[PDB]
Amino acid sequence: KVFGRCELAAAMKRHGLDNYRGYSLGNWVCAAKFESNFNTQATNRNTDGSTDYGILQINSRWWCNDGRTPGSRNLCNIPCSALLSSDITASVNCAKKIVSDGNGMNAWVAWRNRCKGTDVQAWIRGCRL
């Protein structure tokens, strides 16, 4: 599924991401835009052989099992394919674990490079939330 901006904002809010660990909703929408272009089916292979999955490009070395990443820790205890669903629940639940892990949203390179320090509230402007 390719989400619209406000549609995704609403879904993330309902799943409790607004101000989760102090990160306002715009941060999460901005991260999803630049990680996946709002596409739940996005996948991208990394140099180390791991793969990133879904709307928030969650990595198979640490967080999910895709059966081809040796030494995967599967900390979200889910197959990576579950992160590609039209239903973003699994992605949100896993992302909550990631952002609690110590470096906050810096875990997402696109967030650090393209969202951090910017006017992220622009990402939810005009939306009926």
Using rule CB under 5 A, residue 57 touches Ni ion: yes
Query: Does 48 show up as a binding residue in the annotation?
Result: no
Work out how close the CB of 11 gets to Ni ion at its nearest, in angstroms, rounded to a whole number: 21
User: For Cl ion, which residue of 11, 74, 104, 127 counts as binding (CB under 5 A)?
Assistant: 104
Distance of alpha carbon 7 from the chain centroid: 15
Please say whether the beta carbons of 72 and 65 come within 8 A.
Answer: yes
Q: Which residue is nearest to Cl ion (CB)?
A: 104
Which residues have a Cβ under 8 Å from the Cβ of 9 and sit 6 or more positions away? Answer: 25, 29, 123, 124, 127, 129
- Annotated catalytic residues are 35, 52
Reported in sequence order, the residue ranges of 1-129 that DSSP labels E, i.e. its strands, are 43-45, 51-53, 58-59
Give percent helix, percent strand, percent coil of the chain, each to the nearest 5. Answer: 40, 10, 50
Strands 58-59, 43-45: pairing kind:
unpaired
If the CB atoms of residues 77 and 118 are measured against Cl ion, the closer one turns out to be 118
User: For Ni ion, which residue of 17, 52, 84, 95 counts as binding (CB under 5 A)?
Assistant: 52
Choose the stretch contacting Ni ion; rule: CB under 5 A; options: 4-12, 54-62, 80-88, 92-100. Answer: 54-62
Work out how close the CB of 104 gets to Cl ion at its nearest, in angstroms, rounded to a whole number: 3
Give backbone dihedrals phi and psi of 52, rounded to 5 degrees, phi first. -100, 140
Which partner, Ni ion, Cl ion, none, binds residue 104 by CB below 5 to 8 Å per kind? Cl ion
Q: Which residues bind Cl ion (CB under 5 A)?
A: 104
Known binding site for substrate: residues?
101
